[PDB]
Symmetry: C4
Subunit: 98 residues, 4 copies
Amino acid sequence: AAIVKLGGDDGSLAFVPNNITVGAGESIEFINNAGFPHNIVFDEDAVPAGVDADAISAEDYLNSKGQTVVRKLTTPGTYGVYCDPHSGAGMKMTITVQ
Amino acid sequence: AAIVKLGGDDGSLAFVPNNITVGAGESIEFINNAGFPHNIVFDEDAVPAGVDADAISAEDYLNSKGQTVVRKLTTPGTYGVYCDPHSGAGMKMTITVQ
Amino acid sequence: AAIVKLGGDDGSLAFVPNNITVGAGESIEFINNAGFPHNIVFDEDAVPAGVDADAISAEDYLNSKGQTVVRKLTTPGTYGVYCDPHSGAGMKMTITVQ
Amino acid sequence: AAIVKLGGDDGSLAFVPNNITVGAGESIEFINNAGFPHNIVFDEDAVPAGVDADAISAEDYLNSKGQTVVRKLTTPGTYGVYCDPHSGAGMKMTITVQ
Ligand SMILES: [Cu+2]
Ligand SMILES: [Cu+2]
Ligand SMILES: [Cu+2]
Ligand SMILES: [Cu+2]
């Protein structure tokens, strides 16, 4: 089970960490930390063939500390993730599935 | 009128109870309890023929204790429900309509 | 300018009032009162020909007291409005435009 | 980096300022100020050819003071922006890109 914080303790508009490697079917926990609001959008152009980006995204805004979104990915490959609100700020990450 | 709590008192990411039987036209009350945020998504692949899953879902995030969503189902059958945010955590239920 | 409260002071899941008459171009103010969350959905099957129900709706959840949504309607006729979350509870209204 | 406040200090349902000029690729910061909730919708009929209004919008409601949405625009032209909730109130702005 991998943990990714949304917003840095210093208030940076980043995924912490912004690079992670998980096994297929391994739980990924996104925990709302700082710099609200955030969301988790899987990039339409940077997910494996056959994966439905819209289904794995979590678009509604996370506006409170400690809120969690849990996902499991099964198709191996790299996945580009970004936070819509803070896209302009470079708030994005890469998830590698094995 | 059936009551289903969103999140366990212990903070489990579950529908309590996760199995319920209601009559057609009987009110179903979903009450936000713990482990925010939650939502109520009727599974496209597990609802009766003719039911419009999108119309009975309530996709916007419930972020506060005591918030209520009220639904009435009229087509008899079983309905698979899940919480998008916590899908990865197994937060799902079954509603049987008579 | 017409005022419609979302939720009764007693906590009823109602539009107060649930019947109103406004002039074309007259401001309609929806004020979040009690029994959160609420939204304002214009019924696809009960709005005048040519009106785009999706454009006049305000679907994101209103979760705080005092929040306001302002609309102006120009096509004369009756408009059926409902609160998605509390549809099961009979939380609906009628707006007559002149 | 341009700053635009959502809601006036006096509680007016306005973008402050409601007219701004930025360079292509320059960061635009929308900061939630007063008169919640607000959102940022780029007008389908008033953005440059080729720009995807839906991608640059930020439709989920901003319900707290200090929340920030960051955008970067690269296609030169004028862009009409409005706040859905307060459209009826005249809460709109113009962004000129160079
Ligand atoms: Cu973010
Ligand atoms: Cu949940
Ligand atoms: Cu309501
Ligand atoms: Cu606004």
